[PDB]
Amino acid sequence: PQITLWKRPLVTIRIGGQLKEALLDTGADDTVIEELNLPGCWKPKLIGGIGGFIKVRQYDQIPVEIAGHKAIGTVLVGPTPVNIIGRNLLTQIGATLNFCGGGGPQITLWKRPLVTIRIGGQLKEALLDTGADDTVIEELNLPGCWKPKLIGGIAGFIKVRQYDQIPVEIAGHKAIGTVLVGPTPVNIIGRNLLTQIGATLNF
Numbered sequence: 001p002q003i004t005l006w007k008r009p010l011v012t013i014r015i016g017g018q019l020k021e022a023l024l025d026t027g028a029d030d031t032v033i034e035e036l037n038l039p040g041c042w043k044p045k046l047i048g049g050i051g052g053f054i055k056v057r058q059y060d061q062i063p064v065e066i067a068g069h070k071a072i073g074t075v076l077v078g079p080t081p082v083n084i085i086g087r088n089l090l091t092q093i094g095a096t097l098n099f100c101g102g103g104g105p106q107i108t109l110w111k112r113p114l115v116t117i118r119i120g121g122q123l124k125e126a127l128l129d130t131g132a133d134d135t136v137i138e139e140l141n142l143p144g145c146w147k148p149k150l151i152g153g154i155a156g157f158i159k160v161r162q163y164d165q166i167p168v169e170i171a172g173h174k175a176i177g178t179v180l181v182g183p184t185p186v187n188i189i190g191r192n193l194l195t196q197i198g199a200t201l202n203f
């Protein structure tokens with residue numbers, strides 16, 4: 001299908017014979033599911049995101065049906081806030097990111113979807129993250145007024161400064177909206193700005 005980003009891109013998946021809800025997440029390298037039992041052996045791993053790391057169980061070669069499309073690959077199981085389908089499985093089902101509903105660039109998900117943005121008169125690299133509600137940019141001395149906010153990622157919450165009505169040009173496409181500034185490991189463009197540029201998931 002084609003999926004717009006005004007709402008979280010939640011879909012039903014089937015895994016181990018059970019149905020679950022999960023977020024299609026272009027900003028995730030891997031697929032991470034809440035605690036459950038899976039057939040087969042697993043091994044311990046750590047994965048990270050905002051706020052640091054969690055311990056997970058890695059299962060390899062697990063069949064997963066994602067909105068009716070078949071994948072077989074690695075599933076990490078542990079205390080993730082949200083079930084997420086990451087690039088390891090999105091690539092198996094042929095998912096791409098498309099600007100302006102496919103009139104604009106197509107971004108495949110073989111590697112992290114990093115693009116150039118312009119914000120506050122600076123050029124920066126940022127990850128297009130369909131699993132992010134909001135846009136989070138690394139500490140940057142923006143002039144002007146802000147309000148405090150906390151935002152939560154795989155390893156916890158971080159404190160950020162919320163700035164409103166900030167222009168952000170994304171690969172040449174002009175957007176304007178709320179930007180959160182704080183200590184993220186990667187600059188993140190979230191749905192609040194992806195929607196303004198007509199970005200869709202397609203598979």
Ligand SMILES: CCCC[C@@H](CN[C@@H](CCCC)C(=O)N[C@@H](CCC(N)=O)C(=O)N[C@@H](CCCNC(N)=[NH2+])C(N)=O)NC(=O)[C@@H](NC(=O)[C@@H](NC(C)=O)[C@@H](C)O)[C@@H](C)CC
Pocket residue numbers: 023025027028029030031032046047048049050080081082084086112127129131132133134135136151152153154184185186188190
């Ligand atoms: C779990 C919560 C939902 C998914 C998550 C995906 N964000 C990416 C951002 C990239 C890192 C800052 C992420 O955590 N990615 C991980 C997912 C875990 C995974 N293993 O795939 C990742 O790829 N981690 C890499 C590390 C990044 C560097 N890797 C690399 N360069 N190859 C990894 N392998 O450990 N979204 C978020 O973290 C966002 N959270 C949200 O959108 C919502 N919050 C919550 C708690 O649901 C909203 C209510 O605030 C943050 C950014 C605030 C807007």
